[PDB]
Structure formats: structure tokens, C-alpha cells
Amino acid sequence: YFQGVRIITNYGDLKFELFCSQCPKACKNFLALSASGYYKNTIFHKNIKGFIIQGGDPTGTGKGGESIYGRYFDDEIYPELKYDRRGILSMASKGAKKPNTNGSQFFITYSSLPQLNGEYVIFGKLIDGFETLNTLENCPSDKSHKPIDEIIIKDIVIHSNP
């Protein structure tokens, strides 16, 4: 089952395993947006050391993005999927506060974050590119947590092992 994707950035590649069985709606959205080029030449607009790095807004402001299903789609949230390691991949939203408000924006965690458990859809985990994530974490941000130099997602591709 579970597929891999590679997020190709201007600082190197991040490889994620996606949780296909558990979170098919979140995974299909991410795959279909990725395939249609929706994430090409976009930025991570928020980067907070020891917390999260967030991108996936074609607008780059943190206000935009929509799903393949419409503006929003429903949560796939489970006790078995937790923020229990560095490199978890999730959908941004306004907290499960305003449930079922996933769009296109996503974030990657820099550590275990039990306060986020149940709050956001987790749908993958980093399996390779840990060195890339270290580099990203150390990229300076301004006071609004915006990278000073742009962190760019060139593309997100479905990875096939040779």
C-alpha cells in the first residue's frame, strides 16, 4: 500500500511516507494537487524552530489554497496517528475550533508535539531527507516567522523505488 512522495525544495529533498489506508481523502487531495502542479514554485511562509514549517498556499500569504473537493474537506483524525516524532506531515486548518476545514496548506513538525494531537489531520511522516529538514529548521525567519530568504517547493512528486 503506502505511497511515498518527495518534496523537492531549494534546500534539498524531503521524502514522506503517506498514510493511504487511514487518510485516503487527505492523501488523494495532496497527490492530486501535487500532480496538477498546484504546489510548484510555492513557498513555506511560516517556519518556527522546534515547532513546525508550513507551506502549500499558492498565494504564499497563509490565507489561500483550496482542496480538490472544494474550499474545505473533512478531517481524518485518529488516536493511532499522533505527533510523536519529528517530521510528521499534516494538513493546516483552524484546529479541530473549526473542524473539517482542510484546504491545500500543509505543515511538517520539527519534534513530538502532543498538544496538537486531535487538532490537525496527520497523513504522512518523513522517511528520508532528515538532513534537509535540519537545514530548513536553521533557516532564519523574520519576526512574523517568514523565512528571510525564500524556502521554495519546486515540486512534489510521487516517488518510485528503482
Is 86:95 a contact under the CB 8 Å cutoff? no
Instruction: Please give the resolution of this entry in Å, rounded to 1 decimal.
Output: 2.0
Is 58:103 a contact under the CB 8 Å cutoff? no
Chain discontinuities in the chain, listed by preceding residue (C to N exceeding 2.5 Å) = 96
Q: Name which of 37, 35, 26 is nearest 67 in CA terms.
A: 26
Taking the C-alpha atoms of residue 110 and residue 147, their distance in angstroms, rounded to an integer, is 16
* SS3 (DSSP) at 130: helix
Instruction: Enter the C-alpha cell of residue 63.
Output: 490565507
Taking the C-alpha atoms of residue 55 and residue 44, their distance in angstroms, rounded to an integer, is 4
Method: X-ray
Taking the C-alpha atoms of residue 152 and residue 39, their distance in angstroms, rounded to an integer, is 10
CA 10 to each of CA 40, 83, 108, 150: distance values in angstroms, whole numbers, following the listed order? 12, 26, 16, 9
**What separation, in Å, do the N-terminal and C-terminal C-alpha atoms of the chain show?**
17
CATH 2.60.40.1250 fits 1-162, yes or no: no
Residue 138, beta-bridge partner list: none
Taking the C-alpha atoms of residue 33 and residue 67, their distance in angstroms, rounded to an integer, is 8
Please enumerate in sequence order all residues whose Cβ is within 8 A of that of 1, keeping only pairs 6 or more positions apart, or say none. Answer: 20, 21
